[PDB]
Structures are given as structure tokens and as C-alpha cells.
Amino acid sequence: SMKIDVVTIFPEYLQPVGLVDVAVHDLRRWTHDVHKSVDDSPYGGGPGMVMKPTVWGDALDEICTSETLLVVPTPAGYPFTQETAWQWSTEDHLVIACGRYEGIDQRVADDAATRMRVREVSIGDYVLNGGEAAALVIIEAVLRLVPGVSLLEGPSYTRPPSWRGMDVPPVLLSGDHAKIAAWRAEQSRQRTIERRPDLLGFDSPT
Amino acid sequence: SMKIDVVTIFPEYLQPVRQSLPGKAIDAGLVDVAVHDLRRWTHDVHKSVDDSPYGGGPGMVMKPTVWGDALDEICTSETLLVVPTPAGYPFTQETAWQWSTEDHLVIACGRYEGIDQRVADDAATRMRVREVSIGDYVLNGGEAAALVIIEAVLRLVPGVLGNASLLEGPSYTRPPSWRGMDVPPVLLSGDHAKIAAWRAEQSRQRTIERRPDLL
Ligand SMILES: COc1cccc(Cn2ccc3ccc(-c4cc(N)[nH]n4)cc32)c1
Ligand SMILES: COc1cccc(Cn2ccc3ccc(-c4cc(N)[nH]n4)cc32)c1
């Protein structure tokens, strides 16, 4: 059984979501001023804004326990991989803190780490506008592994066997499991070399 | 302008990002994102979009005839067809930059075990097709990947999303002291050359600790 809490200033963005419950919380519910200002300019200068630690601290205080795995998406995170998804799949409680602006004051994660396990993670080498899309990716990747729910995949085909003058590879129609297993292995390793040579320990392109 | 068409059996999944589009950018015709239910192009009363894999195996494969009709209607020769897949080339910030000046992206979201390969192969004979992965994990389908790609691309298109190597280091804001933790004094020093050097060193350390692959 798993509980996932997502904290965000944009709850509605999380709407794309019995053994697991997922709850979404509006970070602004923990503000005290009438303007509900969650951000301010960075110490030391620079463009953009930083989310204040105070509002986050109060939210996480209420939502997290010492058992919680606090997940913080960030372009500067450790990589979130399939191995990470397997590791997190057996957790009782994930809390996903979604940043906006130019991110969250580092002290939020540092404070939380005195009380619970904290994981700053990146879902890939591109920049999002906030943590919400990363939260959706993480949730989907994790939940499909939850109990009771290498090489690149080769191409797949289904009916009809000829379409627009393009044939399904004859071996797949042959019913010869060994030859089919072999052809699929060759396709996979061929695809991995071309698209992801790093997975086989070769240099990346360009 | 950039037009993005997304084709999916779960059109509701793409609703958040339709919402996240500022009225100004739409009104200025800078961007238009449309979402299409794939079942609109099914042939049968059961609106079937999947069928068993040739050569056997687990799961199901999406039907080429349905996808072919969908893409025939939606794409032109000028379309960049984006097909999320765990077996794709890596989608990176470089990709996002390249795609940000495209006139027309069409994102084909698969489910089950993916789309019959002939769909992409046929499309590639008359338009640019890009099969891409957004990271080394497996999703249930292409929709979350489409959300990521749309966000990463559109935030690079001037004035669209409302937003305006080494890893970025830690950031701090008010208050100067919080739960026993002080903002690093250097940041309040007014020595901006020293601050830049401190930030550079933080970036170097973080990259070493978290992403040694970048070094
Ligand atoms: C914090 O440093 C940042 C620097 C510039 C922009 C942003 C935007 N932003 C805000 C919160 C946030 C959370 C996650 C992500 C993210 C993660 C991955 N893998 N890509 N993008 C991006 C986020 C942050
Ligand atoms: C096609 O090969 C597959 C093999 C096993 C499962 C699935 C699930 N699935 C279906 C359609 C689909 C589209 C994209 C993705 C995806 C992309 C990234 N980076 N992770 N996951 C996953 C998808 C597909």
C-alpha cells in the first residue's frame, strides 16, 4: 500500500492522476499574509524568483512524517531512473514537493533531511517550468511497479500483415519462437546501438 | 506561430497544459494546442485501437490502420511528428530548442505496448518523424511524455508560457535565518565577483556529486 501527497501552487495541473491513494495539496493553503506571496528575489542576485522556505516548512511539517520519502524534482537533481522507480515502488509514503519560479530555497530540503529521507531528482536533461509535470512522470513510473498493479525495445506489429504495401517481418508470422526471439534480439541491439549507444558502453553522438 | 496537435486515447490527460496557456499568447496567435481523441479514427463499433502482437508476447499493439487515418488527417509534409517511446532517441534541452521554432508539431501518444512500427515508417516517407524518450524509465503511455515535451518546448517560445554543462547550485531567499540555517554570508557580501566564484564552485561540487557523467 502506498500514499502519495503532491504539494503544488498549481493543484489543477495534477488532475491527470485501492492499493494506492494520491492526494494533491495547494501550497498556498499554508500562507498567512493576504497576498499569499510564496516567492521572493534570490539572495546574491540573479534573474527570477525563489520560493520562500517558510511556507514550505509549514506544509511539510503537517504532511510528512519521519517515514516519508520527500521527493523534490529539480533540473539539478540526481537522475530518476527505472532503478529509482523500483526502489520507490515499495515505499509507504511519497511526498512530492513541486517547485515553480526558479526553484525552492535550499533550506527546505536541508531542514527536511534532518527529519526524513530527501531525494532531489531530475527526470531528464531538459528544463520544465515547474515540478508538476515531473511529479506526473514519477507517479506514473512508480505506480505501475507497485506490487499488485538495459536494452531498447524493438519494433512491434499487429494486423493486418500487409498495410499500405508494408509487410510485417515474415519471421514474426512464421511461428518459429527461436527465430522470432533471435530477430527481436537483433532488432533491439541494433536499435540500442543507433539510438542509445551509451547503454552498451559506447560514446554518445555529436 | 506554433501549432501542436496531440493524438491520444486519453484526451483529458492533456487538459492541464491547454489550461496553462496564457490568453495573450493564444490571442496573439503565437501558439495553439489541440488535443484529439484517437478513437475518432476507429473503424468498428467497438472503437478498437489495439490488437495482438505478431510473433506473440505480452500486452497489445496499437493498430496501424487507425493511426494511419489519424495522422493522414492531421499531418502535412511540413509536420514534425513526435512519437514518445522508451526506445526513442533522447529528448534533451537541445531537442527542445530545435523544436521550439517548428510551425507544426504532432505528438502521437501510444498506450499498451506501443504503436505498430509501420505507422512511423510510413509517416517518415513524407514528413520528419522523431521517436524520442524523455528519460530512462518506463511510463504507461506517451501522454506524460507529451506534457513534458510541450512544456520544455513552449517555454523556449518567446512569450508563450509566462516564463522569461554544470548543474545549478542552491538558491536562497528571505528570511536570512530559518530553522537554524543561515543563508551563506557570501551572498549578502556585496562582492559580486566572489559571489559568482562561490556559485561556480557550488555548481562544480553538485555536478561531481550528482552527475559525474557530465564531467
Ligand atoms: C531549480 O532550478 C531551476 C532553474 C530554471 C528553471 C527552473 C524551473 N523549475 C522550477 C521548479 C522546478 C522543478 C523541476 C524542474 C525540472 C526538472 C527537470 N528534470 N527538468 N525541469 C524545473 C523547475 C528551475
Ligand atoms: C513502446 O515500448 C513499450 C514497452 C513497454 C511499455 C510501454 C508503455 N508505453 C506505451 C506507449 C508509450 C509511449 C512512451 C513511453 C515512455 C517514454 C519514456 N521515456 N518512458 N516511457 C511508454 C509507452 C511501451
Given a contact cutoff of 8 angstroms between Cβ atoms, the answer to whether B139 and A137 are in contact is: yes
Domain with A84, as residue range(s), is 1-149
A132 in the same domain as A107: yes
Distance of CA B133 to the CA centre of its chain: 9
Q: How much distance in Å is there from the Cα of A201 to the middle of ligand 2?
A: 23
Write down the residue that cell numbers 540555517 correspond to: B181
A128 in the same domain as A160: no
Shortest CA gap B186–chain A (Å): 8
Distance of CA B9 to the CA centre of its chain: 18
> Which residues are paired to A205 by β-bridges?
none
Rg (CA), chain A: 22
* CB of residue A128 inside a 6 A radius of ligand 1: yes
Q: Which residues of B143-178 are buried (b: 16+ CB within 10 A; e: fewer)?
A: bbbbbbbbbbbbbbbeebbebeebbbbbbbbbeeeb
Structure-block grid coordinates of residue A37 = 506571496
| CATH code at position B212 | 1.10.1270.20
> Beta-strand (E) ranges in A52-169?
69-79, 93-97, 117-122, 162-163, 166-167
B210 in the same domain as B108: no
B121 in the same domain as B186: no
B189 in the same domain as B171: yes
* CB of residue A60 inside a 6 A radius of ligand 1: no
Given a contact cutoff of 8 angstroms between Cβ atoms, the answer to whether A143 and A149 are in contact is: yes
Given a contact cutoff of 8 angstroms between Cβ atoms, the answer to whether A67 and A116 are in contact is: yes
Burial class (CB in 10 A: 0-12, 13-18, 19+), A70: buried
A158 in the same domain as A127: no
Helix (H) or strand (E) holding B144: helix B143-154
Strands A50-51 and A39-40: antiparallel
**Structurally, how many domains does chain A consist of?**
2
Which experimental technique did the depositors report for determining this structure? X-ray
In 3D space, the residue among B65, B58, B90 whose CA is nearest the CA of residue A160 turns out to be: B65
Among the partner residues B93, B169, B172, nearest to A127 by beta-carbon distance = B93
B112: number of Cβ within 10 Å:
18
B148 in the same domain as B171: no
Using DSSP's 3-state secondary structure scheme, residue B25 falls into helix
Does A129 contact chain B (CB < 8 Å)? yes
How far apart CA B195 and CA B200 sit, in angstroms, is 9
Given a contact cutoff of 8 angstroms between Cβ atoms, the answer to whether B74 and B107 are in contact is: no
Burial class (CB in 10 A: 0-12, 13-18, 19+), B184: middle
B53 in the same domain as B76: yes
Given a contact cutoff of 8 angstroms between Cβ atoms, the answer to whether B41 and B70 are in contact is: yes
A91 in the same domain as A157: no
Rg (CA), chain B: 22
A175 in the same domain as A73: no
Domain boundary among B162, B177, B196: B162
* Nearest ligand 2 atom, CA B145: 17
- A49's CB contacts (< 8 A; 6+ apart) are A39, A40, A41, A42, A101, A102, B173
- For this entry, resolution in Å reads 1.7
Structure-block grid coordinates of residue A71 = 521527493
Structure-block grid coordinates of residue B79 = 509536420
In 3D space, the residue among A147, A162, A154, A62 whose CA is nearest the CA of residue A112 turns out to be: A62
A142 in the same domain as A130: yes
